Design a protein around this motif. Structure first.
Motif, short mmCIF file in Angstrom:
data_model
loop_
_atom_site.label_atom_id
_atom_site.label_comp_id
_atom_site.label_asym_id
_atom_site.label_seq_id
_atom_site.Cartn_x
_atom_site.Cartn_y
_atom_site.Cartn_z
N UNK A 1 16.52 -15.62 -4.04
CA UNK A 1 17.06 -16.53 -5.05
C UNK A 1 16.61 -16.04 -6.43
N UNK A 2 17.55 -15.50 -7.19
CA UNK A 2 17.22 -14.89 -8.48
C UNK A 2 16.49 -15.86 -9.42
N UNK A 3 15.47 -15.36 -10.12
CA UNK A 3 14.65 -16.17 -11.01
C UNK A 3 15.46 -16.75 -12.16
N UNK A 4 15.06 -17.92 -12.64
CA UNK A 4 15.62 -18.45 -13.88
C UNK A 4 14.64 -19.40 -14.57
N UNK A 5 15.09 -20.02 -15.65
CA UNK A 5 14.28 -21.01 -16.34
C UNK A 5 15.19 -22.00 -17.05
N UNK A 6 14.66 -23.19 -17.31
CA UNK A 6 15.42 -24.25 -17.96
C UNK A 6 14.48 -25.29 -18.53
N UNK A 7 15.01 -26.14 -19.39
CA UNK A 7 14.22 -27.16 -20.09
C UNK A 7 13.73 -28.27 -19.16
N UNK A 8 14.45 -28.49 -18.06
CA UNK A 8 14.04 -29.49 -17.09
C UNK A 8 12.82 -29.01 -16.30
N UNK A 9 11.92 -29.93 -16.00
CA UNK A 9 10.82 -29.64 -15.10
C UNK A 9 11.41 -29.53 -13.70
N UNK A 10 10.73 -28.80 -12.83
CA UNK A 10 11.19 -28.71 -11.46
C UNK A 10 10.03 -28.81 -10.48
N UNK A 11 10.19 -29.69 -9.50
CA UNK A 11 9.21 -29.91 -8.45
C UNK A 11 9.90 -29.59 -7.15
N UNK A 12 9.24 -28.85 -6.27
CA UNK A 12 9.87 -28.50 -5.00
C UNK A 12 8.94 -28.44 -3.81
N UNK A 13 9.54 -28.42 -2.62
CA UNK A 13 8.79 -28.39 -1.38
C UNK A 13 9.68 -27.81 -0.28
N UNK A 14 9.07 -27.10 0.65
CA UNK A 14 9.80 -26.61 1.80
C UNK A 14 9.86 -27.71 2.87
N UNK A 15 11.04 -27.90 3.44
CA UNK A 15 11.24 -28.91 4.47
C UNK A 15 11.22 -28.26 5.85
N UNK A 16 11.74 -27.05 5.92
CA UNK A 16 11.86 -26.38 7.19
C UNK A 16 11.81 -24.88 6.98
N UNK A 17 11.02 -24.19 7.80
CA UNK A 17 10.86 -22.75 7.67
C UNK A 17 9.75 -22.36 6.71
N UNK A 18 9.79 -21.12 6.24
CA UNK A 18 8.74 -20.59 5.36
C UNK A 18 9.34 -19.80 4.20
N UNK A 19 8.90 -20.11 2.98
CA UNK A 19 9.51 -19.56 1.77
C UNK A 19 8.49 -18.93 0.82
N UNK A 20 8.81 -17.74 0.32
CA UNK A 20 8.00 -17.10 -0.72
C UNK A 20 8.46 -17.61 -2.09
N UNK A 21 7.66 -18.47 -2.69
CA UNK A 21 8.08 -19.13 -3.91
C UNK A 21 7.29 -18.60 -5.10
N UNK A 22 8.01 -18.23 -6.16
CA UNK A 22 7.41 -17.67 -7.35
C UNK A 22 7.59 -18.59 -8.55
N UNK A 23 6.47 -18.97 -9.17
CA UNK A 23 6.49 -19.68 -10.45
C UNK A 23 5.61 -18.88 -11.40
N UNK A 24 6.16 -18.49 -12.54
CA UNK A 24 5.42 -17.63 -13.46
C UNK A 24 4.93 -16.38 -12.74
N UNK A 25 3.64 -16.11 -12.85
CA UNK A 25 3.04 -14.91 -12.28
C UNK A 25 2.62 -15.10 -10.83
N UNK A 26 2.89 -16.27 -10.27
CA UNK A 26 2.33 -16.64 -8.97
C UNK A 26 3.40 -16.75 -7.89
N UNK A 27 3.12 -16.16 -6.73
CA UNK A 27 3.99 -16.30 -5.58
C UNK A 27 3.17 -16.87 -4.43
N UNK A 28 3.57 -18.03 -3.95
CA UNK A 28 2.90 -18.61 -2.81
C UNK A 28 3.81 -18.64 -1.60
#
Ligand SMILES: O=C(O)C(=O)Cc1ccccc1
Ligand SMILES: [Co+2]
Ligand SMILES: [Co+2]
Length: 220
Positions: free
Chosen positions: A42-69
């Motif tokens: 999922x190509x990176x982007x940015x916007x004025x809205x805050x964004x909160x997220x969570x995985x519901x099913x499976x496993x995801x490599x999530x990147x915010x700023x310099x961090x990938x969890x």
């Protein structure tokens, strides 16, 4: 009459890379359930809205700023403050189902952990037999809830806190201001402050939901 207010009809977003998203909106807040196919970026982007997220099913490599969890289902959350770049990759052989909330209020201050990811704050019974799990930041509280089958109930009530939520397993009857909907997987509801709401699960299987409070209700 106003059921569309509390239980918005979702829009489908279908990308060319196979990602599918279900969008529900009320006023200043949007809920998106995303299905990300195996080995997909999922190509990176940015916007004025805050964004909160969570995985519901499976496993995801999530990147915010310099961090990938590496996010395990239902075990962490992330907050991407306004204008912080963020993107993700499903690096697994299996579909990822993820949830994210996008929002912008003039009077809210979108703090986050310095490395962007929230771990479990506390697990506990909200009502006898009804187990919940919390992720907590200053301006938002995520509460996983399990409603027991065969009569599990959240009695009618109201509160100052805005409350938005999505069913992520099983089914249950959700009522907001006299409007009752049969929640299923992915169904979203939106409660403004002080709006009457309640719920009962009459099925055999327990029902799971993700509920979100602005500001935090239980852990302040
Ligand atoms: O704790 C609350 O304020 C709730 O409204 C809890 C809840 C849990 C599951 C469905 C609806 C409400
Ligand atoms: Co985004
Ligand atoms: Co409530």
């Amino acid at each position: 009459d106003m059921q569309e207010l509390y239980f918005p009809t979702p829009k489908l977003i279908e990308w060319e890379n196979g990602v599918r998203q279900y969008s529900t909106v009320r006023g200043d807040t949007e809920v998106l359930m995303s299905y990300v196919p195996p080995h997909t970026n999922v190509e990176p982007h940015q916007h004025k809205e805050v964004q909160i997220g969570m995985v519901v099913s499976g496993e995801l490599m999530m990147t915010v700023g310099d961090v990938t969890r590496k996010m395990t289902a239902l075990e962490s959350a992330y907050i991407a403050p306004p204008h912080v770049p963020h993107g993700a990759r499903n690096d697994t052989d299996q579909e990822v189902i993820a949830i994210d909330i996008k929002r912008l209020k003039a009077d809210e201050t979108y703090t986050s952990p310095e490395d962007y990811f929230l771990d479990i704050f506390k697990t506990r019974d909200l009502l006898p037999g009804m187990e919940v799990t919390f992720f907590v930041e200053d301006w938002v509280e995520i509460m996983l809830a399990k409603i027991p089958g065969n009569g599990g109930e959240m009695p009618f009530h109201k509160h100052r806190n805005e409350q938005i939520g999505i069913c992520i397993g099983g089914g249950y009857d959700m009522t907001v201001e006299g409007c009752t909907v049969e929640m299923k997987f992915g169904t979203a509801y939106f409660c403004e402050p002080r709006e009457d709401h309640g719920a009962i699960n009459r099925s055999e299987k327990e029902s799971k939901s993700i509920n979100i409070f602005f500001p935090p209700r239980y852990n302040r």
